[PDB]
Ligand binder design. Sequence first.
Ligand code: PD2
Ligand code: PD2
Ligand code: MN
Ligand code: MN
Lengths: 309, 312
Amino acid sequence: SMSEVERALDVLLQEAEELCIGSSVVELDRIPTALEFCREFYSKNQPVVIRKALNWPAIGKWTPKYLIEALGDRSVDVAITPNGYADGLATQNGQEYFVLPLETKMKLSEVVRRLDDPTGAVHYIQKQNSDLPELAADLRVSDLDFAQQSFNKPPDAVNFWLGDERAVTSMHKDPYENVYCVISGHKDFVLIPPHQLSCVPRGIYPTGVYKTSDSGQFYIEPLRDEEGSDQFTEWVSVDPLSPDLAKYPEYARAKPLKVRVHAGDILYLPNYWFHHVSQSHKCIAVNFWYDLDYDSRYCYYRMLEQMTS
Amino acid sequence: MSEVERALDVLLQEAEELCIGSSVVELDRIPTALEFCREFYSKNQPVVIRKALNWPAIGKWTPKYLIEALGDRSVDVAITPNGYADGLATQNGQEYFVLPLETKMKLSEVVRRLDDPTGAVHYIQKQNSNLSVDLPELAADLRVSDLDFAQQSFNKPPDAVNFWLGDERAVTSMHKDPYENVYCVISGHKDFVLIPPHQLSCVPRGIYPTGVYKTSDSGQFYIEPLRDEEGSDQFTEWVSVDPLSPDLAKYPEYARAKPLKVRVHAGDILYLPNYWFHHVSQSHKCIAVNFWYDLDYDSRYCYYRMLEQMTS
Ligand SMILES: O=C(O)c1ccnc(C(=O)O)c1
Ligand SMILES: O=C(O)c1ccnc(C(=O)O)c1
Ligand SMILES: [Mn+2]
Ligand SMILES: [Mn+2]
């Protein structure tokens, strides 16, 4: 038999199984109305993927070469890793850390050159925007009103991504509503619903950052507080691509959803959904992050965090 | 405190600090379907809209006009001695959950009994879609299309439409319904006390023998316990507290609860979201109608079932 907290958790999971909560990513051929989106997806905290939804100029024009021609081969901020796991788990001297990317700057064409070398380190570009007007002129952001009218606030962030196939984003959650638009290539998402939290292994790890030495080899440097001892972070311990079900029995009761998002597709990723992200080589994407509007679901989720701490 | 009580403390802290289910929103104008979906339905948040309806009914529906328009036909009426149909009452040392005495009588007969201050409490409260079922001719004095602003968020027709006409002594004890509720007062006013689902742990609940009101040959009311052949009580889980006069010594947990009071006048619309606890009083001969819609399941319902397991 099981504990009191575990009886409560089991009731949650059984009720959500019977009702098939978060059991499928809805597939749409056409952009829904603002009301359809509010009713069927936003208010139900439910992912949706809209196929061939966008006809943006970008979708054709945008490549690394065209971006170099357009942006004037500017200097950008790029994240670098030895293993391709920025914000991810890595071992050193037998200790598993949560490591942050080595963040540096370089010329866009140099980034492109370093993307074509399989032998080198893994690079990805994540630009946190709000030349740049020229780039914004290749996008019809109004096409996303159907979703924005549900959130009733402007994008709190608009990110541009250009990255290596080797760049894998490990499973994590975000306090945002997320509208994701692939421009070039395809992005693979693995999604787990919030309420399955108790089936997702999480641990506490010393946090570090990747650094190069004089010789150019990578190591992990522990991160430390204002003055004194180490810093920690809580992070998903399981690998969705190859779950070790022996080490993590409970993960077998989870139900991950797999969705591939192609150029011209839209993916609504609701707030606090677990996701793991892969992509094709030199995939380009832009996504819009909206601050969430707190409802009782968030409070239940905080409670669930407390129960499964 | 235990792990479960710690988790419940988290739930209540976050909800209180984020102003979740913390008030009834007043509007003077009917929202748009999108506004209603975003601000009230998707948030499971109650809202009252003042002077929202201009139905013919709001002018004309009285005891007399209903006696005339319905040809003084016979109707279902719930009767109690204390005014608590489907409520708790004590007898011979035992607290029972009591079902009302249900009978049929002429509409004019009911009106005569509402005019008796000393009589038993009468209430036309059958619900189970008694307006569409038993009173179709009244439907022409309403305009259900005016509720489209909310109906589009439910995306299904009303699964029930109820008609209420009761005594000021007829009080409905606190309970929850598996429905989205659109409440339209026609005459008089209705007083609601509301508590959000996530405060379930602040609401005491008990298992009670079930009974039903009966009269003796002399006309005295009494509770008859409901039992099967074996002599065993059939039980009902019910809210134990009286929102009007809470007994915080008996029920300390109700201290952390925050009831919301709202009076709904003729022409006002109240949206009572699914599984919201509600207690209902009314003015004398208040007339109301309301529309029940089956709820659309999401993870909140699973969390509420977990909350019920956590507090039993
Ligand atoms: O595209 C990504 O690599 C990525 C990484 C982390 N987060 C997100 C997101 O859409 O939230 C996307
Ligand atoms: O108006 C009432 O008396 C009443 C009683 C019980 N329930 C409801 C309801 O609208 O759910 C209304
Ligand atoms: Mn993310
Ligand atoms: Mn009710």
